[PDB]
Amino acid sequence: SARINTWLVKGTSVDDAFLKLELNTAGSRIFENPKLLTWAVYVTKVPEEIILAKLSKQFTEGSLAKMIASAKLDSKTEGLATILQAQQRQVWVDAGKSSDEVFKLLQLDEAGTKLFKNQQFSTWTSFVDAFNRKYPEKAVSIFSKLAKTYDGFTLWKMLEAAKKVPKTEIIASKLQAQQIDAWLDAGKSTDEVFNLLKLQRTGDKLFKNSQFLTWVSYVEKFNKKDPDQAIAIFSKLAGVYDQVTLSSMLEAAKHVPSTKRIASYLQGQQNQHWLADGKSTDDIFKLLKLNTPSPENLIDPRLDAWTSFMRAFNMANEGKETTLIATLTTHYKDRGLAQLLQEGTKFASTKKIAEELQTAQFARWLQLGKTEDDIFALLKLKLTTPTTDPEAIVFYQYKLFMDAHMKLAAA
Amino acid sequence: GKLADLFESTALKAQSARINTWLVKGTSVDDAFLKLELNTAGSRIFENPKLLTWAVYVTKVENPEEIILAKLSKQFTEGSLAKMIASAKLDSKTEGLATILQAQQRQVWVDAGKSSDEVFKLLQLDEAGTKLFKNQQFSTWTSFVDAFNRKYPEKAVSIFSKLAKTYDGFTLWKMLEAAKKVPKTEIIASKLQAQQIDAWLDAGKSTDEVFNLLKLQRTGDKLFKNSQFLTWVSYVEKFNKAIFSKLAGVYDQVTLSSMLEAAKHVPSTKRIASYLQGQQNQHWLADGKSTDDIFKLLKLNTPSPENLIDPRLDAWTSFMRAFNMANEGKETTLIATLTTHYKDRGLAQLLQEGTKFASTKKIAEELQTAQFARWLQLGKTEDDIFALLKLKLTTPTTDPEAIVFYQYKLFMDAHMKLAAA
Predict the structure, then answer these.
(1) Do B52 and B90 reside in the same domain of the chain?
(2) Residue B91, Cβ neighbours under 10 Å: how many?
(3) I want to staple A390 with a disulfide (CB 3.0 to 4.6 A). Which of A100, A201, A342, B314 is the partner?
(4) How far is Cα A17 from Cα A7, in angstroms, rounded to an integer?
(5) What is the four-CA torsion angle of B319, B321, B323, B329, rounded to 10 degrees?
């Protein structure tokens, strides 16, 4: 206020001005005192070293650190706190304090999994920066310390979580990058980093864990570094999961944008390995349990895993290429499948596919040259069969189709 | 017959003339269902007012709730019908109906003899992972397990046995512990925690096993900060019916002392820490250690000013109370021990320096007047403390000791009545 304007006229000592404000009897709550802002202003006008010295004879360095840290949080003392944090940093640097000791100073020992939440974290990192540019010969990475304090997985989680809050979003990602590289230089195998990230601890929920993408990112850098040791990433998964559950996981993962691109590739790998083993489209059809007559498997992801494999099988064996309605006719029967699709047409979930499938079954019949009494025979119909029965409907719709395709009947 | 009551407070549009037409003619619920084309309505069926109209009409011709769902069971798959009803339960405009139907579906699954495992997969809680208790259909499934357990006691199965076979102990615990703070789920969650403990008891696993299991080895000086520690404590107290000896075999006595004294100030771990510190005390007395052995042990014998906000000092005063009430007559003192280990001069500068920092001035001032008082009782004169504070003529007034001396004489001047003795 106008106090300063009086003290300047008189010539009052900064010490006396500090005393006249009773700031020597102010507790840990010192910064909230506007009298401190006014005195700190008075001191600037005759610098930053002095404020910090006087505060350093009334507050322990560690405690002062916290006070300044939380002092940056108040809009009214943002400036002062920063200048003081810089002076304090400069002092620690000159005094030659280790990064380990500043770490103790700020009591980050005792913040565990909560470190990046701790408000005095940036205090310590800014110190490590300053120390590293003043003492390059004995310079030490921030990360090397974190990595020395926490095991790989805990550190990973802390980081992964810390980039969610923007205040630290940048730094966390930076450190995440360093962590990966730190594994590379440490000569860790993809298997070690695999177990390290606890991906064993995951079940059929592997591609649902974000650390899996981290491990993939690791293995594709590991493969480029040392390709005399490069690994088949599908071969590990194949050594630790069933073909059925692995198929399920892969087809699910293929529909999440994050994992879409690695899941597609890996399912390709599965296809190709199934082909090299001698599995046929019918082998895989049975494998994926598609021959058990649940009607829900008409929209099943198992079906997409299968049509994927079918696609793969065909481009190998040209000329001898299979079909979905062909395979469904093979495992269920003509009658069986007719029943199946007709039932499918009732439920909303399966109504498009079944219809799409039904006419397919009709087309196969038409080209095979099946006549009305042939299908009547092969649906095992009787005269006293209700027209409302599944097959008795299918049969009719086939007659409408056949009657609407007199031209193609050449086949 | 709940459903009839709900369609009283229901807003119909024209909707109620359709129904009254159907009552007049007498048209069947089935044909009335056909005339509304609801057999071709699909997954957004509940948003369709014609469903409201048909369900109201069905209430007007019957337990109608059995029929509605039955009809719905021929147009929608079991799982999908479940899900639809679930999200129908979320919108205020279709609530009674949705809940009542969810109950009917429950009973139908029970009658059909469905396993709890199959209802579990149906509601897709298999594909819900550590998020299970967050899931809106968790309670659906628990209601099924209840209904199934009262229908088939011979084939009854605990909810917990399923959770416990699906998740490992630690993740399950974290899940429970997290869900119990969520108020919607606390009650059931807490039951499961009890059962988990009980399930460890019956599975005959060791206290060491439950210890390692709960991830407590790489807790360090931060053991009492992980809440699962209480879970393990609670375990051993059910198991016995010696915890300090275990803690003593895995920690030094000084960090253990600090940890306990700290733990005594968090309400959760308070009282177990109090008790365990009691055990440390008693074990400290039974070996024969005296207050100075412990003082030195606890690193208190060096004049660090940080010993003024230290928990170790408090651990020490704890042991002092304990020693004093045992070894009676030969009772030690705080200022005595500080005078013995630091020296008169040493302790004097220590406290004087302590008085400046806001951090330590309470303790430092109380201790200071303590030291002054002991000086007075001993009959130490101005020139005596001047002598042993090793002060000189040319000593600056601002030196610690040079202040102490002054403070003592001022103390002496306001206490001379008592000084008569």
Answers:
(1) no
(2) 11
(3) A342
(4) 8
(5) 160
A349: nearest CB among B80, B356, B357:
B80
Same domain, A210 and A241: no
Closest by Cβ to B356, choosing from A58, A349, A350 = A58
Between A59, A346, A348, which is nearest B43 by CB? A348
CA-to-CA separations, A368 to A328, A373, A375, B45, B179, in angstroms, rounded: 16, 14, 11, 40, 61
Residues A336, A212 within the same domain: no
Q: At which of A179, A200, A224 does a domain end?
A: A224
| C-alpha distance from A278 to closest chain B C-alpha (Å) | 32
Instruction: Answer yes or no: are the C-beta atoms of B299 and B254 closer than 8 Å.
Output: yes
Minimal Cβ distance to A347: which of B76, B225, B360: B76
Residues after which a C–N gap over 2.5 Å breaks chain A? 46
Q: Is residue A324 domain-shared with residue A301, that is, in the same domain?
A: yes
Residues of chain A with C-beta less than 8 angstroms from the C-beta of B74: 346
Q: Give the residue among B284, B222, B232 at the shortest CA–CA distance from B259.
A: B222
| Technique used by the depositors | X-ray
C-alpha span between B361 and B147 (Å, rounded) = 66
Q: What does the alpha-carbon distance between residue B70 and residue B269 come to, in Å, rounded to a whole number? A: 55
Pair A264, A390 in one domain: yes
Distance, CA of A124 to CA of A106 (rounded, Å): 8
Identify from B30, B37, B80 which residue to disrupt to test chain A contact, counting A C-beta atoms within 10 A and taking the largest count.
Answer: B80
Both tokens of A314, joined, read 């065909």
Smallest Cα distance from B127 to chain A, Å: 8
Residue finishing a domain among B241, B257, B292: B241
Residue numbers after which chain B breaks, C to N beyond 2.5 angstroms:
13, 62, 241
Residue A53 shares a structural domain with residue A41: no
Residues 24 to 53 of B: which have CB under 8 A from any A CB? 41-43
Contact with chain A for residue B359, Cβ under 8 A: yes
| Residue B154 DSSP code | G
Q: How many domains does chain A have?
A: 3
Resolution to one decimal, Å: 3.0
In order of A118, A175, A218, A280, the CA distances from A170 in angstroms are: 16, 9, 20, 50
**Pair (A286, A148) in one structural domain:** no
Asked if A208 reaches chain B (Cβ–Cβ under 8 Å), the answer is: yes
Chain A partners within 8 Å of B42 (Cβ): 348, 351
**Chain B residues within an 8 Å CB radius of A347:** 75-77, 80
SS (H, E, C) chain A: CCHHHHHHHHCCCHHHHHHCCCHHHCCCCHHHCHHHHHHHHHHHCCCHHHHHHHHHCCCCHHHHHHHHHHHCCCHHHHHHHHHHHHHHHHHHHHCCCCHHHHHHHCCCCCCCCCCCCCCCHHHHHHHHHHHHHHCHHHCCCHHHHHHHHCCHHHHHHHHHHHCCCHHHHHHHHHHHHHHHHHHHHCCCCHHHHHHHCCCCCCCCCHHHCHHHHHHHHHHHHHHHHCCCCCCCHHHHHHHHCCHHHHHHHHHHHCCCHHHHHHHHHHHHHHHHHHHHCCCCHHHHHHHCCCCCCCHHHHCCHHHHHHHHHHHHHHCCCCCCCCCHHHHHHHHCCHHHHHHHHHHHCCCHHHHHHHHHHHHHHHHHHHHHCCCHHHHHHHCCCCCCCCCCCHHHHHHHHHHHHHHCCCCHHHC
Asked whether residue B168 falls in the same domain as residue B312, the answer is: no
| Domain assignment of residue A284, given as a range | 232-411
